[PDB]
Write a protein that binds this DNA or RNA. Sequence first.
RNA 1: UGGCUCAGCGUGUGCCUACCCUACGCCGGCAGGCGCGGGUAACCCGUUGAACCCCAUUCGUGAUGGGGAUCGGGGAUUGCAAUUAUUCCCCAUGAACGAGGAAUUCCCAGUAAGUGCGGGUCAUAAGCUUGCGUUGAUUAAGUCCCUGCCCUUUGUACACACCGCC
Lengths: 75, 104, 55, 129, 143, 72, 145, 184, 72
Amino acid sequence: RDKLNNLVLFDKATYDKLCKEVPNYKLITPAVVSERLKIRGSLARAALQELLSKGLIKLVSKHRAQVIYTRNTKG
Amino acid sequence: AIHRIRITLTSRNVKSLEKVCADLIRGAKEKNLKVKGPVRMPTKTLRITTRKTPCGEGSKTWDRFQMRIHKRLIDLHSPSEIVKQITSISIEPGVEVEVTIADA
Amino acid sequence: GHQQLYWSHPRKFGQGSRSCRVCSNRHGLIRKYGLNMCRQCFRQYAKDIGFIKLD
Amino acid sequence: RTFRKFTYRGVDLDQLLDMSYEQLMQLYSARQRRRLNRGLRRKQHSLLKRLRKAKKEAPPMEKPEVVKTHLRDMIILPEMVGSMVGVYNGKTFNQVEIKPEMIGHYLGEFSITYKPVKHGRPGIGATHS
Amino acid sequence: PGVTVKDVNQQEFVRALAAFLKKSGKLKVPEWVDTVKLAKHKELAPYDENWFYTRAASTARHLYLRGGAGVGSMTKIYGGRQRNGVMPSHFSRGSKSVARRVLQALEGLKMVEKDQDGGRKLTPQGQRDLDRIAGQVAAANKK
Amino acid sequence: KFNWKGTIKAILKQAPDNEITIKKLRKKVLAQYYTVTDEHHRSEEELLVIFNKKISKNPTFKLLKDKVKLVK
Amino acid sequence: MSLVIPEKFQHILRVLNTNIDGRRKIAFAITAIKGVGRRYAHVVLRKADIDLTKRAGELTEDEVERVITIMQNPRQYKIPDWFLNRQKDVKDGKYSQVLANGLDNKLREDLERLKKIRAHRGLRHFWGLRVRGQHTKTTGRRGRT
Amino acid sequence: DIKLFGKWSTDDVQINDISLQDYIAVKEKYAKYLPHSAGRYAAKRFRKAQCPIVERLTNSMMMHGRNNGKKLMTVRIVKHAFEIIHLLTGENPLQVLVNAIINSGPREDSTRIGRRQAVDVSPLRRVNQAIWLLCTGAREAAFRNIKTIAECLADELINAAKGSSNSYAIKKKDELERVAKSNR
Amino acid sequence: GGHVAQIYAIRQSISKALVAYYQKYVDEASKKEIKDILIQYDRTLLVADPRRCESKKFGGPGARARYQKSYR
RNA sequence: UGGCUCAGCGUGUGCCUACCCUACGCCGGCAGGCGCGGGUAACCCGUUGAACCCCAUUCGUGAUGGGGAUCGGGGAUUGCAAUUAUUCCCCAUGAACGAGGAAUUCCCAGUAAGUGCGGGUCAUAAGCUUGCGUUGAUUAAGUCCCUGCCCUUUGUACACACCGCC
Ligand SMILES: [Mg+2]
Ligand SMILES: [Mg+2]
Ligand SMILES: [Zn+2]
């Protein structure tokens, strides 16, 4: 554990890894998807807002210091 | 006028000031005067705090002096030819008086 | 002496202007409320000026 | 040494000599401009008079006579260039060549008031535990 | 109904009023609005192209709910804490020019004028169209 | 080994009129002792009584009732 | 905005002599050149009319060239006069923003002309001492032994 | 009925331990809307026993020195943490907080000067100690990290309530129990 | 006051005003039931909190705290 | 970066003695300037639109948009005079510092701590002090272990009194 030092404007591999891995697990925050894939964290916020614009995820809290998303329910 | 005048009473002593206000007001009320009662302006506290030692040596103790000023206002509705003599008989050396017209 | 350079440095503003009204000292001068007394002389005369230690 | 241009703010020393006070106020910086816009008192003018007299009494092609002064807050004016000024330290009168490229400064910053220090050995209690 | 300025949330009221005020292109905007620094106790001139419209909006709102304000009142209103290096912080006032300019620009829209005392206050036109914007934003939030 | 009499004499030499208050002398001597010594078992009170024996019990020094003076 | 990546993403820019990190956002990216701070970078990109929300890598080379030619020539493009770095120079009187190793050159020549006339500030720069009138008894020993 | 933060109905939680259900205040009479009041809970002994648990957590969260009066920040920190917890596990956030406090409070400790004997822990010291350990674990996990303080608190509480030897709190509890056992 | 102090003053004033309005103009048992349902939830809804603030004393930054003391 | 929204103490034109607090309008990007009023004061500054806090934005674990030392250039204000930078403003410059060894201070409820605001000093001026509110806790209701204090019995070759005497 020396430095993180990696990522912004992700490639196609990280893009479709996001699109198939992110929208189906429970806690979706910019921090957990930043540390999850490799994402910087402002890019994570932008990507999560774009996913919410498509409608693959659900907005829960939306505070200026913490934004919380979740997967769509299954029935 | 029929003249409205205002009397301002200031002192450092509360009890003697209230004695002067009370005796002036009852002397006015017995003389068929319409008087607005003593309006107590908020008291002023002058708060010099100093170092308590002539030199600079010691444990840094401080003196906290204070002096308090109390104000009252009394309003009268008759010419001055009776109020000058009714206030000249209420002196009580700690009280300092301005008499002034509502026009001033 | 002579007249045009004796007291010629301007004693306007500053510690060379002001002095205690009792002892003519220049240090520790209280100029609040126009007392213009040094702190030691004020402690000496505060009781009969009207200032009381009350709290 | 290749070029011989002085060019203080884009203007060289000749038209910077014949120009009056009110536009070399605009030529200077803020502190010197405020000093000039405000009153320049009697003893400053006496120093300038002595400098002009010692300048014009000098025989050609050597330096003029040294003029002493206590006024180590005088603005170095273009009128003052090439003069011989002794500026007081409190202790001595220091010989200063008024060069052309020192015309925005005070006389006090060319006569140092203290001896720069070179340290001896720390004496006894100079190093505690 | 209802409604007035007082009974709606003021954040998106300022957002909506600035949007209305930008949309009708009659507000006079000076030429230096991108080099201002906006009240010298802060750096980095605002992260917005259109800060002038929002400032005019909040000035109009403040003059609506407290009248008689002048340039000193506005430079007290938009003041803040000046971080001051290694020395401790203090309170600094706002920029006087931007307050004077937003006041004069709002006077150009005939929705504020100098009252009989010092300062400025809303016209009936000004409080009319602020209450209309308040009605719009209140209807937007409730529905 | 710290030299008590030599350090006290050196301090008294670098003094106006070969004269110093007991407090200033004690301060400088103790600072010197702490900055040169190799022994550590000695306590503060033992050092204080050692210093008192050094100054009050030397024929080269005199006590002018609050001070130490170098005699010739 | 940007969905995945620009295909032609310049990771490291090379502008005057310095390496501009292309992953930073553009104002805070070009602040890595001397003479240009956060404030000046923000005003020159406001004058260049580029979107501030894009990072330094996805600027095209013409946009970079425009940013540079309005950075080196600020007065022709209505940068305010009081905003500049070297204004009313003591050598030529003209107003400029020194923005390069030339800024190092200008600082060097200011120091050596003060040293050459042997003024007090030049003398204290010649020694290792503080210039702006600070007390030197207690602080400032980190550079010293 | 009171249903703290407008959700998470309170009257379903269970405190299993007798010793700590005497000193944990999440039940129906200590059921309040917000974890904020001007309580005057420090005027006598054991008045903090009847302060509700969520407000004790917010009180201990308002600490490292740059956060000393900032209670509204800690109220929304706790609110966000509770939403994250209910979203992660589906359990009532009050119940998992109670289980974390149960599982993180040490039950034996050692003290002297001449840690000589191992003593027992009062069932108010272990509540305080558990809250302190949980808040310290969340604080140290979030310090130089991208993760915000809310989900750090959330993961601290869920790992402590399961019991994993992976929270800071239960690691510290086990280490204290081990040292106490060493000289019992 | 501040932000929070104003919040608490507002809610105490509303509760006490409802209790006074009920007691002066409707039956006393209604006042008793609203009053006691307010007392078993956060007594400060009806009774003011008397703790104000303590004065600074001249040896430190605040009421109780004292300036740091140096020994040597 | 923007938006929103709340204080309390208290000072203000002076014997010698000039030096007050400022609203409002205009000019300047700012510091500031120029006019015009009010206040010897519960009357005017002033409903003292304080800061932290609150809401929204950008940043994203990088000595980084953390931090702001050091230094260059320029503009003002006070002053009779600012250089050894008075203070302030603007653009640049962008150092140590990644939570601190042995030691050691203060503190138990509106307290500690955070956060600003007055007064003194003051022509010019607070990293100091003395006050004031604002947000607001953790732990404790004990003991004599360490540092000391008081009382009783006791020992003593001390009485400059254990830093003693020897
Ligand atoms: Mg405090
Ligand atoms: Mg940096
Ligand atoms: Zn006196």
